[PDB]
Amino acid sequence: DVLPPEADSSIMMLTSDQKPDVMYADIGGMDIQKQEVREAVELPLTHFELYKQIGIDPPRGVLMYGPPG
Amino acid sequence: IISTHLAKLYDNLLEQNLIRVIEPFSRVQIEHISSLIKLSKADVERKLSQMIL
Amino acid sequence: DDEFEEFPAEDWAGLDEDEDAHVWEDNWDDDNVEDDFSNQLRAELEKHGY
Amino acid sequence: GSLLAKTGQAAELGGLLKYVRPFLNSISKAKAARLVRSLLDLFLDMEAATGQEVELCLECIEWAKSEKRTFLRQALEARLVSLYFDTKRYQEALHLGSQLLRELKKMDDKALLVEVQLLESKTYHALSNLPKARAALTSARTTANAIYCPPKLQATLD
Amino acid sequence: GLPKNPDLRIAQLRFLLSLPEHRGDAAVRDELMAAVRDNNMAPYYEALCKSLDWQIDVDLLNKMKKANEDELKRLDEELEDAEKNLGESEIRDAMMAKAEYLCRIGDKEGALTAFRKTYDKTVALGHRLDIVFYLLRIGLFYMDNDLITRNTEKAKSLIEEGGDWDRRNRLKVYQGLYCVAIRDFKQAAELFLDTVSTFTSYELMDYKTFVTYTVYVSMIALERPDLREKVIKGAEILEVLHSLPAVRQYLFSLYECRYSVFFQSLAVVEQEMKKDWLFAPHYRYYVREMRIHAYSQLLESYRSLTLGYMAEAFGVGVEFIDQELSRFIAAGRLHCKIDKVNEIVETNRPDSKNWQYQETIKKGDLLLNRVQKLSRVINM
Numbered sequence A: 001d002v003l004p005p006e007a008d009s010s011i012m013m014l015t016s017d018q019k020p021d022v023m024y025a026d027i028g029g030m031d032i033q034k035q036e037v038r039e040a041v042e043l044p045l046t047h048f049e050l051y052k053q054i055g056i057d058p059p060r061g062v063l064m065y066g067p068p069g
Numbered sequence B: 001i002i003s004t005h006l007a008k009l010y011d012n013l014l015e016q017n018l019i020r021v022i023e024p025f026s027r028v029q030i031e032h033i034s035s036l037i038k039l040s041k042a043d044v045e046r047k048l049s050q051m052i053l
Numbered sequence C: 001d002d003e004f005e006e007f008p009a010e011d012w013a014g015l016d017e018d019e020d021a022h023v024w025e026d027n028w029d030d031d032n033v034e035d036d037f038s039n040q041l042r043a044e045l046e047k048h049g050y
Numbered sequence D: 001g002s003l004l005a006k007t008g009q010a011a012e013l014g015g016l017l018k019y020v021r022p023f024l025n026s027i028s029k030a031k032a033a034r035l036v037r038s039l040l041d042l043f044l045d046m047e048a049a050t051g052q053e054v055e056l057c058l059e060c061i062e063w064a065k066s067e068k069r070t071f072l073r074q075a076l077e078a079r080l081v082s083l084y085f086d087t088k089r090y091q092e093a094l095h096l097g098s099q100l101l102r103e104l105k106k107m108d109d110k111a112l113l114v115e116v117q118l119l120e121s122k123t124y125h126a127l128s129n130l131p132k133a134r135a136a137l138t139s140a141r142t143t144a145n146a147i148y149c150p151p152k153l154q155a156t157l158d
Numbered sequence E: 001g002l003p004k005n006p007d008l009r010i011a012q013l014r015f016l017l018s019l020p021e022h023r024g025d026a027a028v029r030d031e032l033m034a035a036v037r038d039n040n041m042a043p044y045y046e047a048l049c050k051s052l053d054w055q056i057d058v059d060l061l062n063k064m065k066k067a068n069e070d071e072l073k074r075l076d077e078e079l080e081d082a083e084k085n086l087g088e089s090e091i092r093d094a095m096m097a098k099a100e101y102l103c104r105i106g107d108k109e110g111a112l113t114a115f116r117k118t119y120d121k122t123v124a125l126g127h128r129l130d131i132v133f134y135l136l137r138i139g140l141f142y143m144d145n146d147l148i149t150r151n152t153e154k155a156k157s158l159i160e161e162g163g164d165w166d167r168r169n170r171l172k173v174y175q176g177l178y179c180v181a182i183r184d185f186k187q188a189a190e191l192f193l194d195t196v197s198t199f200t201s202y203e204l205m206d207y208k209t210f211v212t213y214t215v216y217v218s219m220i221a222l223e224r225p226d227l228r229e230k231v232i233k234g235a236e237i238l239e240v241l242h243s244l245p246a247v248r249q250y251l252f253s254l255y256e257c258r259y260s261v262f263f264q265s266l267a268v269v270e271q272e273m274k275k276d277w278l279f280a281p282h283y284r285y286y287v288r289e290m291r292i293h294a295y296s297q298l299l300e301s302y303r304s305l306t307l308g309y310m311a312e313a314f315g316v317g318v319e320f321i322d323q324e325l326s327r328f329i330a331a332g333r334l335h336c337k338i339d340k341v342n343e344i345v346e347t348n349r350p351d352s353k354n355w356q357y358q359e360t361i362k363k364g365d366l367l368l369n370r371v372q373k374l375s376r377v378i379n380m
């Protein structure tokens, strides 16, 4: 047999989706930049079809090298 | 956000009053339900319908 | 391969038009003849007075 | 102008506004611009000549465009967007706000942008455009962070 | 994509002048005001049926057509003779100018020949997409349902597979095949609520006309499930109903299930659909299907609602509703019976078990017919 679930094999958090904890604009940090982050969410926000045709190469990995600020 | 919310709240009390007085009855005449809610027949029937549709 | 012409093959001699030339699916009630509904409702409004 | 507003005069205030134009183009642009805005707001306050208020202010905008007072004419465009929302205008307010946003985002004004975005959020809510109202309101906050103590404006955003 | 949209307008104007004879005075005016323009002589073999054989512009207008067509033809000859440009070159757009001249000015026959010529010549992604769009637009112009099906079939099969973010620019008219046809129930709406227009106001004559098609298709689709969260929640939907109060009136009337205003507004909807070339459900799904949904919605959650009181709650003319109910029950829907001796509507709603079990035995009948046919296929 093969187990379909994979997240609970070593825990390490699970599906945090479908749950509004902190929506978006309710953050106190406003932007810092948050435009590269919205650029990061462009791929989840569909737009992968717009990644082609328009000829862009959307970013894949986003590293935030900041303190707990 | 004045008439809309008051109408929404008015619907809430109508639904709550109907649901609060409806558990005992397996089959109740609707003019008795109107008498308990202290309203007419057409409005009570219309509200009870819109809930059940 | 034969067309079985022994059975009476009366081909439809019109060859004029296809009434449902498009993909429309008809129903037994769809082909009744009336003055639709708008005129009928107007007549209904008139006999009631408004 | 103060006495005309106190008494409630409309024709006299309109004539005064149409007459003071030589003096408007003889002094500091900002001082003349704000005097025009104050007189216009006072005129639009009490006497509700809905068939004349829009036309009179549009004439003032055209006059401001002729005088090349871009910040003045932008301010009156924002005022008519507010007036359009007051008069429940459907979409001519929307394109006017869109035109203002295009002209203003290229600049770096902040008070006008917050008012325009807030007005755009208001008219979406009036037309029950909730998701676009939320998006406009979020942009209104992002723009409103610049002004630290706009006591009237901060209440409007809240 | 702007061309063939004003052509759609004149095509609709010809429809309004031809099919409904009630519009025989204003329809002539709008037809004339848009046929003396737009160079309507080659697209006047259709127009001669309603009005005169030819309006009194023959000398000047034909000279304009022949001169304009000859100039483009001379231009096409120069590109295809003096220069050997082939494939990925400017000859591709030169023949597009040829097709545009043969379409916007000349008759559809020359434009179709020009299109099929360059479609077989160049198969580039951008060129192929543009010509498929043009073929669809001319097909929906001249009401060639065969051409509309042909371009829709190839586009949905292979053409739209290659290249993305342009299908969002095409489904609004790719689903027009379902819109013009009877299939306004499920497939139309599911691919047509998408409020992503290729142009602000084009293709279907407007964005407002785009919404009216959405409202009509949705009304044929469903009565009152959580449509409040499907179309009513739509902010752009609420905005456009603010733009059109009458359109907002019946849509809210159906949502509020207030039949006193619904039927009057529903008749207005049918009258409006009469003035529209998308009139295919002329006797099936203008008002009869919508009220079948409405009557089903009404009589469900009811058991025995009196004919007299349901008549005044749904208009007037107790006899009119009585004959309407009898006609629709004979049609098959409105699951109920009429107690004529007491004038009562005794409904028969099957339980969730009962109705579903009825559906299974029906599908059992169909599939037994299927397997018996397959039993015929074997042993022969």
Ligand SMILES: Nc1ncnc2c1ncn2[C@@H]1O[C@H](COP(=O)(O)OP(=O)(O)O)[C@@H](O)[C@H]1O
Residues within 6 Å of the ligand: A026, A027, A028, A029, A066, A067, A068, A069
């Ligand atoms: N609206 C807000 N804006 C910014 N920070 C917030 C907000 N609400 C909560 N926080 C804080 O952000 C913190 C995230 O901390 P943490 O995840 O440990 O930092 P890091 O991701 O750098 O390890 C939480 O402890 C929480 O208190």
